[PDB]
Design a protein around this ligand. Sequence first.
Ligand SMILES: *[C@@H]1O[C@H](CO)[C@@H](O[C@@H]2O[C@H](CO)[C@@H](O[C@@H]3O[C@H](CO[C@H]4O[C@H](CO)[C@@H](O)[C@H](O)[C@@H]4O)[C@@H](O)[C@H](O[C@H]4O[C@H](CO)[C@@H](O)[C@H](O)[C@@H]4O)[C@@H]3O)[C@H](O)[C@H]2NC(C)=O)[C@H](O)[C@H]1NC(C)=O
Ligand SMILES: Nc1ccc(C(=O)c2ccc(-c3ccc(S(N)(=O)=O)cc3)cc2)cc1
Ligand SMILES: [Zn+2]
Length: 267
Amino acid sequence: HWTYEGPHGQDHWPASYPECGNNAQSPIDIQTDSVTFDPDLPALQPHGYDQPGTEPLDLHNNGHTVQLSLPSTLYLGGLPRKYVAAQLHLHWGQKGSPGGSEHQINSEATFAELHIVHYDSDSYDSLSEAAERPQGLAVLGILIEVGETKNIAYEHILSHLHEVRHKDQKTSVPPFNLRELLPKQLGQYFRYNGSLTTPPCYQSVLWTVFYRRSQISMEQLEKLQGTLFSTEEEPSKLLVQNYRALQPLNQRMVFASFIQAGSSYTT
Ligand SMILES: *[C@@H]1O[C@H](CO)[C@@H](O[C@@H]2O[C@H](CO)[C@@H](O[C@@H]3O[C@H](CO[C@H]4O[C@H](CO)[C@@H](O)[C@H](O)[C@@H]4O)[C@@H](O)[C@H](O[C@H]4O[C@H](CO)[C@@H](O)[C@H](O)[C@@H]4O)[C@@H]3O)[C@H](O)[C@H]2NC(C)=O)[C@H](O)[C@H]1NC(C)=O
Ligand SMILES: Nc1ccc(C(=O)c2ccc(-c3ccc(S(N)(=O)=O)cc3)cc2)cc1
Ligand SMILES: [Zn+2]
């Protein structure tokens, strides 16, 4: 039903999903001259990422993004609660246009963004249940830019897009090292309270956005931008610009797990 553009586009999400119009939404523009360094933010400690089970992982084109199912055996050890992995998916723009990421750092967007979604298994039994609760979810946001070389880790996913071009189609992806989808310096990240970036826009996400960006080749980007369709059949329409517009910070604080010389903030 909902879409990014059109009568049911994001500008009209609040009309159907009340929370999309609330004031602690995501994504946001993280301006470093306004973040607060928190020396107590722990290392994320992703567990099981190197080997996501031994069974094939499901890759699904749900019409809004391409989604990879993840086993609950994977989890993050550096958060207030034990957050177990549920899935990961992507957001991108379109060939010939700028942007594509959801979050921005110092008002700069990149070409795409990877989201690895987890939920509090200590308190809840399912992603869906946790999705409606305060800090019920923990999502990792990795901004993606273009580099000179092909990124093998991302290729493990991108090499399968041609198998799920139509909405609702699915395929299998052999387990691979998910840690390689993450950028360098995992110890440098931003943390803030936000929401799902798609309807129902529940304000249940404890967000972690990495400071460093991951890089894929220009060829990999063009493939991510124009392989999948948002339609189930002909006529076909390419799935593009599936990223939400920036939402007001609305006086929330954004914390940084690091600080360096020349940082726009102090200790
Ligand atoms: C996302 O949004 C949530 C909800 O608003 C925030 O969670 C709150 O965080 C604050 C600040 O850390 C918590 O308040 C502080 O609680 C401390 C005690 O912590 C223990 O007890 C609480 C209550 O049971 C537990 O929630 C917590 O897990 C611990 O077990 C107090 O020591 C603090 O008091 C001191 O600091 C305040 C200033 O903040 C002074 O005024 C006091 O005098 C004193 O020096 C403080 O009260 C609050 O409990 C949390 N609420 C909930 C529901 O968890 C997240 O921090 C926020 N995350 C981000 C990234 O923004
Ligand atoms: N009709 C519904 C169907 C499924 C659900 C969910 O359980 C659900 C859970 C999480 C998400 C979700 C949305 C966005 C993001 S994001 N883009 O912020 O990383 C993550 C999870 C969506 C739906 C809710 C209502
Ligand atoms: Zn997302």
